Amino acid sequence: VGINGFGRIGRLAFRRIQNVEGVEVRINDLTDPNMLAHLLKYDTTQGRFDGTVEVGGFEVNGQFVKVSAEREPEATGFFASKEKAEQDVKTVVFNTNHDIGTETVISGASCTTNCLAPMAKALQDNFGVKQGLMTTIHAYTGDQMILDGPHRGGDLRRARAGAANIVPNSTGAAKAIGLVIPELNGKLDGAAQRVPVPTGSVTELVATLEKDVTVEEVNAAMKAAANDSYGYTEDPIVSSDIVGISYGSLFDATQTKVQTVDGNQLVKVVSWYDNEMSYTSQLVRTLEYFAKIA
């Protein structure tokens, strides 16, 4: 395994890989290894590093790992394309559609799609969804400004102080769900509300189903669909409790609503995820499985 781009996703992917047997990880990033070693050691949201780091590259808990700084050749964000990857791209979400050998380039999807997919999948199999609108109450991220200032991408809301506001933002995750679950292509749209927590998110989905359902039917269905990626809990948890978790998505039975007005129904289903570590865990799970195939 070789990591290009040692930002937040890169450093956590590494951390995650230290506690997985058959993977291990070379790194490439343009910044000072002193800077990177310090940021690997110490982490605000995810706690101190589990081990030692000392700065050719840096050695971690003994083993040397060579860290290069090449301009041109994958978690940099600069090379987010099919052609842009040196030795339609398959969007994969583990334990959802990883069942789709070969390939040049695959995408582990967006952090939000990995939360949405298993829950949305569970609804289509059991009940069949007609349509639905998504809202993710989301932690703030690096593309937001720490204080009100000119955004590089021209976005007037991400220009605002990220940890002092509720900030609406557009997300493609809900619309691009067709690329993992073609059954739901064009059925789901959504938006985000970025809020002052440094990591940890929840995704709410209000949807209309093919057949009538109860609150208990919905919850049971999700408990039945639970696995390593898609968690299940009936504990009244909050965002800090899901920081650092290994589930890509964690369904919360306590927030479920099935509103019946006349014969018609609206179903609300809610799933937690740590936009950092929930995604990174599903990324590594995929990363491992993908090296297994050829």
Residues 192-251 close enough to bind its own copies by CB under 8 A: 193, 195-202, 204, 206, 208, 235-241, 243-244
Q: Is 110 annotated as a binding residue?
A: yes
Is 246 annotated in a binding site? The answer is no
d(CA 290, CA 294): 8
Place of tokens 């967006």: 110
Selected binder of its own copies within 42, 64, 78, 289 (CB under 8 A): 42
Helix (H, G, I), strand (E, B) or coil at 267: strand
d(CA 128, CA 211): 7
- 117 burial level (CB within 10 Å; 0-12, 13-18, 19+): buried
Who contacts 69 (Cβ-Cβ below 8 Å, separation ≥6)?
Answer: 28, 29, 30, 31
Of 111, 145, 270, 287, which is the active-site residue?
Answer: 111
Residue closest to 269 by CA, chosen among 187, 205, 219, 216: 205
Q: How crowded is the C-beta side of 263, counted as CA atoms within 13 Å?
A: 2
Concerning whether 111 is annotated as a catalytic residue, the answer is: yes
Q: Least distance from C-beta 149 to its own copies, angstroms?
A: 6
Using CA atoms, how far apart are residues 114 and 91, in angstroms rounded to an integer? 11
And the tokens for 70?
């090449």
Tell me phi and psi for residue 53, to 5 degrees: -140, 130
Minimum distance of its own copies from residue 274's CB (angstroms): 12
What pairing do the DSSP bridges indicate for beta strands 264-273 and 201-209?
antiparallel
**Is 171 annotated as ligand-binding?**
yes
Separation between Cα atoms, residue 249 and residue 143, nearest integer Å: 23
- Does 115 count as an annotated binding residue? no
Q: CB of 59: closest distance to its own copies in angstroms?
A: 16
Q: Which of 20, 106, 133, 213 binds its own copies (CB under 8 A)?
A: 133
Looking at beta carbons only, is 29 or 74 nearer to its own copies? 29
| 250-279 binders of its own copies (CB under 8 A) | 252, 254-255, 257, 259, 261-262, 264, 266, 268, 270
Q: 133 or 213, CB closer to its own copies?
A: 133
- The CB-of-81 to its own copies minimum distance in angstroms stands at 23
CB of 102 to its own copies, least distance (A): 34
Give yes or no for residue 52 binding its own copies (CB under 8 A): no
189 binds its own copies (CB under 8 A): yes
Q: What is the footprint of its own copies within residues 144-183 (CB under 8 A)? A: 144-151, 154, 156-157, 159-168
Catalytic residue list: 111
Summarize the annotated binding site as residue ranges: 8-9, 17, 20, 23, 29, 71, 110-112, 141, 171-172, 194, 275
